[PDB]
Amino acid sequence: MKRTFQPSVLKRNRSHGFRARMATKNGRQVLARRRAKGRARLTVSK
Amino acid sequence: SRVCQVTGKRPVTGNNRSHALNATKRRFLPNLHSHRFWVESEKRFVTLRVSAKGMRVIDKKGIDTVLAELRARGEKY
Amino acid sequence: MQVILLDKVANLGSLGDQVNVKAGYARNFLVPQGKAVPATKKNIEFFEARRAELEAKLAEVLAAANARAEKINALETVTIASKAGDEGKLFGSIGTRDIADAVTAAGVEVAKSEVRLPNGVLRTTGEHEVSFQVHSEVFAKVIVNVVAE
Amino acid sequence: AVVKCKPTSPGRRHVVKVVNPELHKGKPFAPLLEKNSKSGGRNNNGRITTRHIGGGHKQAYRIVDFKRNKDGIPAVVERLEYDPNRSANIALVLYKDGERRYILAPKGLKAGDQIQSGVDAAIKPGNTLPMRNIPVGSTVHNVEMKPGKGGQLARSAGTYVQIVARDGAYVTLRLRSGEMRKVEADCRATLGEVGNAEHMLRVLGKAGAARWRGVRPTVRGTAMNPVDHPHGGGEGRNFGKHPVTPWGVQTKGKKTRSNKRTDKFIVRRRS
RNA sequence: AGGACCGAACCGACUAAUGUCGAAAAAUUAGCGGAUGACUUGUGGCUGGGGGUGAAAGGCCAAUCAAACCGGGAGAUAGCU
RNA sequence: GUUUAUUAAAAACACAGCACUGUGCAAACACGAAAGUGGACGUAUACGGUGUGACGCCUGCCCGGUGCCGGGAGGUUAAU
RNA sequence: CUUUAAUGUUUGAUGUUCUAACGUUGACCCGUAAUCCGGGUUGCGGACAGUGUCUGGUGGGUAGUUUGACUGGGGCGGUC
């Protein structure tokens, strides 16, 4: 039974990585929101 | 954008009312056109995206005067 | 639109008369070509001051020079040798480029836009008549005899 | 040549093949090749704009010289080659000056044939001349819309146009659709008919044949649900509606030409 | 030569039994279909919610789909329990 | 061959073939407030839509109604 | 006033021609080792096409909604 999550570091970084968020303004707002909440992990860091 | 380079006219949102007074959002667009104006001061043609009202404004005033105002506005033509 | 006319307009040209004209006509033809200047309560005093007669002679000499130029070649004949086809079907249609260049090299020094072709683009091989307009009121006739090579 | 293959197995019973013995059995001319990446019917937005496109064999692009601007240079037909991008075969032609090029192959070409372009050209098939110099009533192909554009009419296998009249600087042509169009006399055209006229006799035989040609299955509107197509819905094959396109436009006899710009060049329409 | 034949890997899931607080939020055992092709598969891309994709079932779109998920309008409204 | 991943694998869907219809190339059509892109670096022996569904015999009568195509005698008919 | 006609006026529909607006997904040159874009020369269309405001027609393509109660369950029928 193949499950939904099939890990891949390259796909994870290129999809939800820090640079991916900064590319668009919506991603920048995502980072801004999580800085405000004080989350330790801003994004998925390798 | 659909902005006249002389009068600054830009699209403005509004309503359109039917017989039953139903209101739906619409948008009014300026009558923009691309026109080439001959300028004797610089001896060449300048292309401006101007509305019909703006073209009347250019005729009433001078093309040189309008260009000076555009330059003072700070936007390249 | 009330404008002052400088050049002779064939229909309503009277050397600076306050005569209405379509905005497009003045905007696209007269003003860009210098045939008129928009005057609105400011240039009327100026036109009657320095444009009233000072440029009248300046405008006229241009017509006089044009009249002199179109009589430079008294022969008024143009002969061009082209490698036409067998029994008609000339090699290729020719407009004003070659004929103007040949005339300029040996004949009347004239601009490209002056030449007008009322009989097509000289398709048939033989004698043809070409109407030359160096001025609005000055028309010239030139006979051209293309000869097959 | 048309060959009917024996029904050794289902999928071969209805196959009709077209075999051209003179086609080149080898790789094409590399310098005139270019990559042709498939699209699958998607546009720059990534959405499907044309349906039933996708898959198929990889095929490279051959730079076919439609303009034919090499005036006054005699050329010799080296060979004929199969072009995957076209219904008609192409011909590799070597000019007297050492330049090779690809051209559409009319019906009459064969290896070693002589072709010439420009106004100072003969009347044999394969030569390109301005339509002013082409005698009226002759058959031409690869006709130009505008001088120097390149050539757009009669490009498929076994296609041609008729020159019917010549008035002033314009010429009237009868297209394969039965429509009469008025074209400038300065436009070039190629004498003769496009070759491979038997290309229409193939039948492909099976479903896979159309599949690896780049065509995907077509689903009928009736088979769909109401939310997907204007047709569809109901139990037991109910239609009860006028035929329409998937986007609501009424098909099956509704004229969709709305140009008002090129109408001046149209003399008669299709009948 | 073949969307050819028999048959493993591989892909799929026609029948039966077991299992239903299971070993497993669809599996196991014994049979079963395709198996050079309209095949299958690795890696990487593209299409985003009244939208996508669909050999078309209202199927699929992160175990959720006749309109996904998250936050907000929002303490929606509830002549009902 | 494909299909309801997880109760339906089928007569359903697709299919080669067939027909109708649109499209002359700045093509029809589609995605996009637009630019632009696909169609196609193709152009009527081509492309899109629709129905039927290999092959053999074939496919009759009906234009009232609703669509679609063409006409203009006459009537009615907006902004202005 | 009914009946008619020379020149001049408002004229509007129609037709032909022209180029200077405008279009050019025609060719060529330059910015430029650039299928974008811009400028220049020329060709072809040309006051058409196209676009804005207003307006008639079409418009389940899309959207918001409605589609009563009594009733020997409801529906049908009947009644108000």
PDB file of all heavy atoms in Angstrom, chain B residues 4-10 29-33 35 37 49-61 66, chain C residues 23 27, chain G residues 52:
ATOM      1  N   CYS B   4      -4.707  57.335 -19.358  1.00  0.00           N
ATOM      2  CA  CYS B   4      -4.349  58.387 -20.297  1.00  0.00           C
ATOM      3  C   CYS B   4      -3.106  59.118 -19.810  1.00  0.00           C
ATOM      4  O   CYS B   4      -2.982  59.445 -18.628  1.00  0.00           O
ATOM      5  CB  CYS B   4      -5.505  59.369 -20.463  1.00  0.00           C
ATOM      6  SG  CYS B   4      -5.185  60.709 -21.633  1.00  0.00           S
ATOM      7  N   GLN B   5      -2.181  59.377 -20.732  1.00  0.00           N
ATOM      8  CA  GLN B   5      -0.919  60.009 -20.376  1.00  0.00           C
ATOM      9  C   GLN B   5      -1.013  61.525 -20.296  1.00  0.00           C
ATOM     10  O   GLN B   5      -0.024  62.168 -19.931  1.00  0.00           O
ATOM     11  CB  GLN B   5       0.161  59.622 -21.385  1.00  0.00           C
ATOM     12  CG  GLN B   5       0.580  58.169 -21.304  1.00  0.00           C
ATOM     13  CD  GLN B   5       1.581  57.795 -22.372  1.00  0.00           C
ATOM     14  OE1 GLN B   5       1.933  58.610 -23.221  1.00  0.00           O
ATOM     15  NE2 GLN B   5       2.043  56.551 -22.340  1.00  0.00           N
ATOM     16  N   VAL B   6      -2.164  62.110 -20.619  1.00  0.00           N
ATOM     17  CA  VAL B   6      -2.353  63.557 -20.590  1.00  0.00           C
ATOM     18  C   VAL B   6      -3.271  63.968 -19.442  1.00  0.00           C
ATOM     19  O   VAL B   6      -2.858  64.692 -18.535  1.00  0.00           O
ATOM     20  CB  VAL B   6      -2.889  64.073 -21.944  1.00  0.00           C
ATOM     21  CG1 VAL B   6      -3.256  65.541 -21.845  1.00  0.00           C
ATOM     22  CG2 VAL B   6      -1.862  63.849 -23.034  1.00  0.00           C
ATOM     23  N   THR B   7      -4.520  63.511 -19.464  1.00  0.00           N
ATOM     24  CA  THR B   7      -5.485  63.857 -18.431  1.00  0.00           C
ATOM     25  C   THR B   7      -5.433  62.927 -17.229  1.00  0.00           C
ATOM     26  O   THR B   7      -6.039  63.240 -16.198  1.00  0.00           O
ATOM     27  CB  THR B   7      -6.902  63.842 -19.009  1.00  0.00           C
ATOM     28  OG1 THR B   7      -7.088  62.654 -19.786  1.00  0.00           O
ATOM     29  CG2 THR B   7      -7.132  65.059 -19.888  1.00  0.00           C
ATOM     30  N   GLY B   8      -4.730  61.802 -17.325  1.00  0.00           N
ATOM     31  CA  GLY B   8      -4.673  60.866 -16.223  1.00  0.00           C
ATOM     32  C   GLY B   8      -5.915  60.028 -16.031  1.00  0.00           C
ATOM     33  O   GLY B   8      -6.035  59.359 -15.001  1.00  0.00           O
ATOM     34  N   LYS B   9      -6.844  60.042 -16.982  1.00  0.00           N
ATOM     35  CA  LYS B   9      -8.052  59.240 -16.851  1.00  0.00           C
ATOM     36  C   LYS B   9      -7.704  57.762 -16.759  1.00  0.00           C
ATOM     37  O   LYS B   9      -6.903  57.243 -17.540  1.00  0.00           O
ATOM     38  CB  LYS B   9      -8.982  59.482 -18.038  1.00  0.00           C
ATOM     39  CG  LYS B   9      -9.596  60.864 -18.074  1.00  0.00           C
ATOM     40  CD  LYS B   9     -10.400  61.067 -19.342  1.00  0.00           C
ATOM     41  CE  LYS B   9     -11.133  62.393 -19.328  1.00  0.00           C
ATOM     42  NZ  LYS B   9     -12.406  62.317 -18.561  1.00  0.00           N
ATOM     43  N   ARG B  10      -8.319  57.085 -15.802  1.00  0.00           N
ATOM     44  CA  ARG B  10      -8.124  55.667 -15.548  1.00  0.00           C
ATOM     45  C   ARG B  10      -9.481  55.004 -15.399  1.00  0.00           C
ATOM     46  O   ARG B  10     -10.474  55.671 -15.092  1.00  0.00           O
ATOM     47  CB  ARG B  10      -7.286  55.444 -14.281  1.00  0.00           C
ATOM     48  CG  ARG B  10      -7.967  55.893 -13.000  1.00  0.00           C
ATOM     49  CD  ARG B  10      -7.107  55.598 -11.790  1.00  0.00           C
ATOM     50  NE  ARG B  10      -5.833  56.305 -11.841  1.00  0.00           N
ATOM     51  CZ  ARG B  10      -4.665  55.747 -12.134  1.00  0.00           C
ATOM     52  NH1 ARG B  10      -4.561  54.460 -12.424  1.00  0.00           N
ATOM     53  NH2 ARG B  10      -3.571  56.503 -12.140  1.00  0.00           N
ATOM     54  N   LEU B  29     -14.323  52.308 -18.937  1.00  0.00           N
ATOM     55  CA  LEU B  29     -12.987  52.419 -19.494  1.00  0.00           C
ATOM     56  C   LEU B  29     -12.832  53.719 -20.274  1.00  0.00           C
ATOM     57  O   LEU B  29     -13.740  54.102 -21.018  1.00  0.00           O
ATOM     58  CB  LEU B  29     -12.684  51.238 -20.422  1.00  0.00           C
ATOM     59  CG  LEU B  29     -12.740  49.859 -19.766  1.00  0.00           C
ATOM     60  CD1 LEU B  29     -12.580  48.768 -20.805  1.00  0.00           C
ATOM     61  CD2 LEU B  29     -11.682  49.734 -18.692  1.00  0.00           C
ATOM     62  N   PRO B  30     -11.712  54.421 -20.129  1.00  0.00           N
ATOM     63  CA  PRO B  30     -11.486  55.616 -20.946  1.00  0.00           C
ATOM     64  C   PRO B  30     -11.275  55.259 -22.410  1.00  0.00           C
ATOM     65  O   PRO B  30     -10.839  54.162 -22.759  1.00  0.00           O
ATOM     66  CB  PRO B  30     -10.228  56.238 -20.335  1.00  0.00           C
ATOM     67  CG  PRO B  30      -9.541  55.121 -19.657  1.00  0.00           C
ATOM     68  CD  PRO B  30     -10.602  54.178 -19.193  1.00  0.00           C
ATOM     69  N   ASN B  31     -11.593  56.222 -23.273  1.00  0.00           N
ATOM     70  CA  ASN B  31     -11.500  56.037 -24.721  1.00  0.00           C
ATOM     71  C   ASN B  31     -10.060  56.285 -25.174  1.00  0.00           C
ATOM     72  O   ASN B  31      -9.742  57.246 -25.876  1.00  0.00           O
ATOM     73  CB  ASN B  31     -12.480  56.960 -25.431  1.00  0.00           C
ATOM     74  CG  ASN B  31     -12.696  56.581 -26.875  1.00  0.00           C
ATOM     75  OD1 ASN B  31     -12.312  55.496 -27.308  1.00  0.00           O
ATOM     76  ND2 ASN B  31     -13.316  57.473 -27.633  1.00  0.00           N
ATOM     77  N   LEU B  32      -9.178  55.381 -24.758  1.00  0.00           N
ATOM     78  CA  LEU B  32      -7.758  55.511 -25.052  1.00  0.00           C
ATOM     79  C   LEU B  32      -7.447  55.076 -26.476  1.00  0.00           C
ATOM     80  O   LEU B  32      -8.087  54.176 -27.024  1.00  0.00           O
ATOM     81  CB  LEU B  32      -6.927  54.677 -24.079  1.00  0.00           C
ATOM     82  CG  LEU B  32      -6.983  55.053 -22.599  1.00  0.00           C
ATOM     83  CD1 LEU B  32      -5.819  54.427 -21.865  1.00  0.00           C
ATOM     84  CD2 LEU B  32      -6.979  56.558 -22.409  1.00  0.00           C
ATOM     85  N   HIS B  33      -6.450  55.729 -27.070  1.00  0.00           N
ATOM     86  CA  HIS B  33      -5.928  55.362 -28.377  1.00  0.00           C
ATOM     87  C   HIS B  33      -4.451  55.714 -28.430  1.00  0.00           C
ATOM     88  O   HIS B  33      -3.978  56.585 -27.698  1.00  0.00           O
ATOM     89  CB  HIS B  33      -6.665  56.075 -29.514  1.00  0.00           C
ATOM     90  CG  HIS B  33      -8.151  55.940 -29.448  1.00  0.00           C
ATOM     91  ND1 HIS B  33      -8.805  54.767 -29.753  1.00  0.00           N
ATOM     92  CD2 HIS B  33      -9.112  56.828 -29.101  1.00  0.00           C
ATOM     93  CE1 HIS B  33     -10.106  54.939 -29.603  1.00  0.00           C
ATOM     94  NE2 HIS B  33     -10.318  56.180 -29.208  1.00  0.00           N
ATOM     95  N   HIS B  35      -1.610  57.438 -30.488  1.00  0.00           N
ATOM     96  CA  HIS B  35      -1.505  58.476 -31.501  1.00  0.00           C
ATOM     97  C   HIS B  35      -0.080  58.999 -31.561  1.00  0.00           C
ATOM     98  O   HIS B  35       0.603  59.084 -30.537  1.00  0.00           O
ATOM     99  CB  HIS B  35      -2.467  59.628 -31.209  1.00  0.00           C
ATOM    100  CG  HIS B  35      -2.827  60.433 -32.418  1.00  0.00           C
ATOM    101  ND1 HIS B  35      -2.221  61.632 -32.721  1.00  0.00           N
ATOM    102  CD2 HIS B  35      -3.731  60.209 -33.400  1.00  0.00           C
ATOM    103  CE1 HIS B  35      -2.735  62.112 -33.838  1.00  0.00           C
ATOM    104  NE2 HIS B  35      -3.653  61.268 -34.271  1.00  0.00           N
ATOM    105  N   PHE B  37       2.136  62.254 -32.379  1.00  0.00           N
ATOM    106  CA  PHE B  37       2.058  63.706 -32.462  1.00  0.00           C
ATOM    107  C   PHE B  37       3.382  64.243 -32.979  1.00  0.00           C
ATOM    108  O   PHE B  37       4.447  63.847 -32.493  1.00  0.00           O
ATOM    109  CB  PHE B  37       1.736  64.315 -31.099  1.00  0.00           C
ATOM    110  CG  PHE B  37       0.384  63.941 -30.576  1.00  0.00           C
ATOM    111  CD1 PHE B  37       0.242  62.915 -29.662  1.00  0.00           C
ATOM    112  CD2 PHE B  37      -0.746  64.612 -31.003  1.00  0.00           C
ATOM    113  CE1 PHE B  37      -1.000  62.567 -29.181  1.00  0.00           C
ATOM    114  CE2 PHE B  37      -1.991  64.268 -30.526  1.00  0.00           C
ATOM    115  CZ  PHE B  37      -2.119  63.245 -29.615  1.00  0.00           C
ATOM    116  N   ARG B  49      -0.248  57.284 -25.549  1.00  0.00           N
ATOM    117  CA  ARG B  49      -1.523  56.606 -25.339  1.00  0.00           C
ATOM    118  C   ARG B  49      -2.452  57.601 -24.658  1.00  0.00           C
ATOM    119  O   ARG B  49      -2.452  57.730 -23.433  1.00  0.00           O
ATOM    120  CB  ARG B  49      -1.337  55.345 -24.506  1.00  0.00           C
ATOM    121  CG  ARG B  49      -2.592  54.510 -24.374  1.00  0.00           C
ATOM    122  CD  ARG B  49      -2.349  53.288 -23.517  1.00  0.00           C
ATOM    123  NE  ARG B  49      -3.394  52.288 -23.685  1.00  0.00           N
ATOM    124  CZ  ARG B  49      -3.301  51.031 -23.277  1.00  0.00           C
ATOM    125  NH1 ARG B  49      -2.214  50.578 -22.675  1.00  0.00           N
ATOM    126  NH2 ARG B  49      -4.325  50.206 -23.477  1.00  0.00           N
ATOM    127  N   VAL B  50      -3.246  58.308 -25.455  1.00  0.00           N
ATOM    128  CA  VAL B  50      -4.056  59.415 -24.972  1.00  0.00           C
ATOM    129  C   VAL B  50      -5.520  59.132 -25.266  1.00  0.00           C
ATOM    130  O   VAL B  50      -5.860  58.439 -26.229  1.00  0.00           O
ATOM    131  CB  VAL B  50      -3.621  60.750 -25.614  1.00  0.00           C
ATOM    132  CG1 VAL B  50      -4.076  60.818 -27.060  1.00  0.00           C
ATOM    133  CG2 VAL B  50      -4.167  61.922 -24.822  1.00  0.00           C
ATOM    134  N   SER B  51      -6.390  59.671 -24.419  1.00  0.00           N
ATOM    135  CA  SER B  51      -7.822  59.533 -24.606  1.00  0.00           C
ATOM    136  C   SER B  51      -8.330  60.579 -25.595  1.00  0.00           C
ATOM    137  O   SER B  51      -7.626  61.522 -25.964  1.00  0.00           O
ATOM    138  CB  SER B  51      -8.549  59.669 -23.271  1.00  0.00           C
ATOM    139  OG  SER B  51      -8.570  61.016 -22.842  1.00  0.00           O
ATOM    140  N   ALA B  52      -9.578  60.402 -26.029  1.00  0.00           N
ATOM    141  CA  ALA B  52     -10.174  61.362 -26.951  1.00  0.00           C
ATOM    142  C   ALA B  52     -10.260  62.745 -26.320  1.00  0.00           C
ATOM    143  O   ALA B  52      -9.996  63.755 -26.980  1.00  0.00           O
ATOM    144  CB  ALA B  52     -11.556  60.880 -27.387  1.00  0.00           C
ATOM    145  N   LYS B  53     -10.631  62.809 -25.039  1.00  0.00           N
ATOM    146  CA  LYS B  53     -10.624  64.085 -24.332  1.00  0.00           C
ATOM    147  C   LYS B  53      -9.221  64.672 -24.281  1.00  0.00           C
ATOM    148  O   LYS B  53      -9.036  65.877 -24.483  1.00  0.00           O
ATOM    149  CB  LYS B  53     -11.183  63.904 -22.920  1.00  0.00           C
ATOM    150  CG  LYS B  53     -11.157  65.159 -22.050  1.00  0.00           C
ATOM    151  CD  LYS B  53     -11.998  66.296 -22.617  1.00  0.00           C
ATOM    152  CE  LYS B  53     -13.488  65.993 -22.563  1.00  0.00           C
ATOM    153  NZ  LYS B  53     -14.001  65.937 -21.168  1.00  0.00           N
ATOM    154  N   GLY B  54      -8.219  63.836 -24.006  1.00  0.00           N
ATOM    155  CA  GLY B  54      -6.852  64.327 -23.982  1.00  0.00           C
ATOM    156  C   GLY B  54      -6.411  64.872 -25.325  1.00  0.00           C
ATOM    157  O   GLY B  54      -5.692  65.871 -25.395  1.00  0.00           O
ATOM    158  N   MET B  55      -6.833  64.222 -26.410  1.00  0.00           N
ATOM    159  CA  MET B  55      -6.490  64.709 -27.740  1.00  0.00           C
ATOM    160  C   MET B  55      -7.109  66.077 -27.992  1.00  0.00           C
ATOM    161  O   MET B  55      -6.488  66.941 -28.620  1.00  0.00           O
ATOM    162  CB  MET B  55      -6.945  63.700 -28.790  1.00  0.00           C
ATOM    163  CG  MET B  55      -6.534  64.044 -30.204  1.00  0.00           C
ATOM    164  SD  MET B  55      -7.096  62.799 -31.376  1.00  0.00           S
ATOM    165  CE  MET B  55      -5.996  61.450 -30.965  1.00  0.00           C
ATOM    166  N   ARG B  56      -8.339  66.289 -27.520  1.00  0.00           N
ATOM    167  CA  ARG B  56      -8.932  67.620 -27.581  1.00  0.00           C
ATOM    168  C   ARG B  56      -8.131  68.608 -26.746  1.00  0.00           C
ATOM    169  O   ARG B  56      -7.945  69.763 -27.143  1.00  0.00           O
ATOM    170  CB  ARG B  56     -10.383  67.572 -27.105  1.00  0.00           C
ATOM    171  CG  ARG B  56     -11.395  67.372 -28.215  1.00  0.00           C
ATOM    172  CD  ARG B  56     -12.726  66.887 -27.672  1.00  0.00           C
ATOM    173  NE  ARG B  56     -13.322  67.833 -26.738  1.00  0.00           N
ATOM    174  CZ  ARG B  56     -13.983  68.926 -27.095  1.00  0.00           C
ATOM    175  NH1 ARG B  56     -14.150  69.250 -28.367  1.00  0.00           N
ATOM    176  NH2 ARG B  56     -14.488  69.715 -26.152  1.00  0.00           N
ATOM    177  N   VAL B  57      -7.651  68.171 -25.580  1.00  0.00           N
ATOM    178  CA  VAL B  57      -6.845  69.041 -24.731  1.00  0.00           C
ATOM    179  C   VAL B  57      -5.562  69.437 -25.447  1.00  0.00           C
ATOM    180  O   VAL B  57      -5.135  70.596 -25.394  1.00  0.00           O
ATOM    181  CB  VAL B  57      -6.551  68.352 -23.388  1.00  0.00           C
ATOM    182  CG1 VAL B  57      -5.437  69.073 -22.654  1.00  0.00           C
ATOM    183  CG2 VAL B  57      -7.804  68.294 -22.535  1.00  0.00           C
ATOM    184  N   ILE B  58      -4.924  68.481 -26.124  1.00  0.00           N
ATOM    185  CA  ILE B  58      -3.691  68.783 -26.845  1.00  0.00           C
ATOM    186  C   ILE B  58      -3.955  69.811 -27.934  1.00  0.00           C
ATOM    187  O   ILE B  58      -3.164  70.740 -28.135  1.00  0.00           O
ATOM    188  CB  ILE B  58      -3.080  67.495 -27.422  1.00  0.00           C
ATOM    189  CG1 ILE B  58      -2.370  66.707 -26.321  1.00  0.00           C
ATOM    190  CG2 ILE B  58      -2.113  67.826 -28.550  1.00  0.00           C
ATOM    191  CD1 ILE B  58      -1.988  65.301 -26.723  1.00  0.00           C
ATOM    192  N   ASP B  59      -5.060  69.658 -28.665  1.00  0.00           N
ATOM    193  CA  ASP B  59      -5.378  70.614 -29.719  1.00  0.00           C
ATOM    194  C   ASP B  59      -5.600  72.010 -29.151  1.00  0.00           C
ATOM    195  O   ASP B  59      -5.092  72.998 -29.694  1.00  0.00           O
ATOM    196  CB  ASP B  59      -6.615  70.153 -30.488  1.00  0.00           C
ATOM    197  CG  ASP B  59      -6.291  69.121 -31.547  1.00  0.00           C
ATOM    198  OD1 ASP B  59      -5.228  68.473 -31.445  1.00  0.00           O
ATOM    199  OD2 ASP B  59      -7.101  68.957 -32.483  1.00  0.00           O
ATOM    200  N   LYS B  60      -6.356  72.114 -28.056  1.00  0.00           N
ATOM    201  CA  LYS B  60      -6.645  73.421 -27.479  1.00  0.00           C
ATOM    202  C   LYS B  60      -5.371  74.099 -26.996  1.00  0.00           C
ATOM    203  O   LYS B  60      -5.122  75.271 -27.304  1.00  0.00           O
ATOM    204  CB  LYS B  60      -7.648  73.274 -26.335  1.00  0.00           C
ATOM    205  CG  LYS B  60      -7.733  74.481 -25.417  1.00  0.00           C
ATOM    206  CD  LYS B  60      -8.877  74.340 -24.431  1.00  0.00           C
ATOM    207  CE  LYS B  60      -9.192  75.658 -23.754  1.00  0.00           C
ATOM    208  NZ  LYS B  60     -10.387  76.307 -24.351  1.00  0.00           N
ATOM    209  N   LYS B  61      -4.552  73.381 -26.238  1.00  0.00           N
ATOM    210  CA  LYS B  61      -3.253  73.880 -25.819  1.00  0.00           C
ATOM    211  C   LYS B  61      -2.228  73.528 -26.895  1.00  0.00           C
ATOM    212  O   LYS B  61      -2.578  73.137 -28.011  1.00  0.00           O
ATOM    213  CB  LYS B  61      -2.880  73.309 -24.453  1.00  0.00           C
ATOM    214  CG  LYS B  61      -3.767  73.799 -23.323  1.00  0.00           C
ATOM    215  CD  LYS B  61      -3.261  73.339 -21.965  1.00  0.00           C
ATOM    216  CE  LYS B  61      -3.526  71.861 -21.745  1.00  0.00           C
ATOM    217  NZ  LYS B  61      -3.136  71.419 -20.378  1.00  0.00           N
ATOM    218  N   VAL B  66       1.938  70.516 -23.286  1.00  0.00           N
ATOM    219  CA  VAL B  66       1.548  69.238 -22.701  1.00  0.00           C
ATOM    220  C   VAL B  66       2.780  68.400 -22.390  1.00  0.00           C
ATOM    221  O   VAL B  66       2.876  67.784 -21.322  1.00  0.00           O
ATOM    222  CB  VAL B  66       0.579  68.498 -23.639  1.00  0.00           C
ATOM    223  CG1 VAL B  66       0.334  67.084 -23.144  1.00  0.00           C
ATOM    224  CG2 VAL B  66      -0.728  69.263 -23.753  1.00  0.00           C
TER     225      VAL B  66
ATOM    226  N   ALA C  23     -10.921  68.836 -37.146  1.00  0.00           N
ATOM    227  CA  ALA C  23      -9.758  68.709 -36.274  1.00  0.00           C
ATOM    228  C   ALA C  23      -8.772  67.690 -36.826  1.00  0.00           C
ATOM    229  O   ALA C  23      -7.556  67.913 -36.798  1.00  0.00           O
ATOM    230  CB  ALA C  23     -10.198  68.319 -34.865  1.00  0.00           C
ATOM    231  N   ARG C  27      -4.988  68.377 -37.679  1.00  0.00           N
ATOM    232  CA  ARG C  27      -4.084  67.670 -36.778  1.00  0.00           C
ATOM    233  C   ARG C  27      -3.128  66.762 -37.539  1.00  0.00           C
ATOM    234  O   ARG C  27      -1.940  66.690 -37.208  1.00  0.00           O
ATOM    235  CB  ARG C  27      -4.893  66.865 -35.764  1.00  0.00           C
ATOM    236  CG  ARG C  27      -4.059  66.175 -34.701  1.00  0.00           C
ATOM    237  CD  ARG C  27      -4.937  65.631 -33.588  1.00  0.00           C
ATOM    238  NE  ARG C  27      -6.130  64.975 -34.112  1.00  0.00           N
ATOM    239  CZ  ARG C  27      -7.379  65.269 -33.770  1.00  0.00           C
ATOM    240  NH1 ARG C  27      -7.655  66.204 -32.876  1.00  0.00           N
ATOM    241  NH2 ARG C  27      -8.379  64.604 -34.341  1.00  0.00           N
TER     242      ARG C  27
ATOM    243  P     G G  52     -13.591  48.202 -25.696  1.00  0.00           P
ATOM    244  OP1   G G  52     -13.376  47.433 -24.448  1.00  0.00           O
ATOM    245  OP2   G G  52     -14.620  47.753 -26.663  1.00  0.00           O
ATOM    246  O5'   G G  52     -13.923  49.704 -25.287  1.00  0.00           O
ATOM    247  C5'   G G  52     -13.189  50.361 -24.265  1.00  0.00           C
ATOM    248  C4'   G G  52     -13.567  51.816 -24.158  1.00  0.00           C
ATOM    249  O4'   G G  52     -13.327  52.477 -25.426  1.00  0.00           O
ATOM    250  C3'   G G  52     -15.029  52.109 -23.860  1.00  0.00           C
ATOM    251  O3'   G G  52     -15.346  51.996 -22.485  1.00  0.00           O
ATOM    252  C2'   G G  52     -15.201  53.515 -24.411  1.00  0.00           C
ATOM    253  O2'   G G  52     -14.693  54.485 -23.509  1.00  0.00           O
ATOM    254  C1'   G G  52     -14.302  53.471 -25.644  1.00  0.00           C
ATOM    255  N9    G G  52     -15.052  53.132 -26.866  1.00  0.00           N
ATOM    256  C8    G G  52     -15.054  51.932 -27.527  1.00  0.00           C
ATOM    257  N7    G G  52     -15.814  51.931 -28.584  1.00  0.00           N
ATOM    258  C5    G G  52     -16.343  53.210 -28.625  1.00  0.00           C
ATOM    259  C6    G G  52     -17.239  53.805 -29.545  1.00  0.00           C
ATOM    260  O6    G G  52     -17.761  53.302 -30.544  1.00  0.00           O
ATOM    261  N1    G G  52     -17.516  55.123 -29.211  1.00  0.00           N
ATOM    262  C2    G G  52     -16.999  55.784 -28.128  1.00  0.00           C
ATOM    263  N2    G G  52     -17.385  57.056 -27.969  1.00  0.00           N
ATOM    264  N3    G G  52     -16.164  55.242 -27.262  1.00  0.00           N
ATOM    265  C4    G G  52     -15.882  53.963 -27.572  1.00  0.00           C
TER     266        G G  52
END
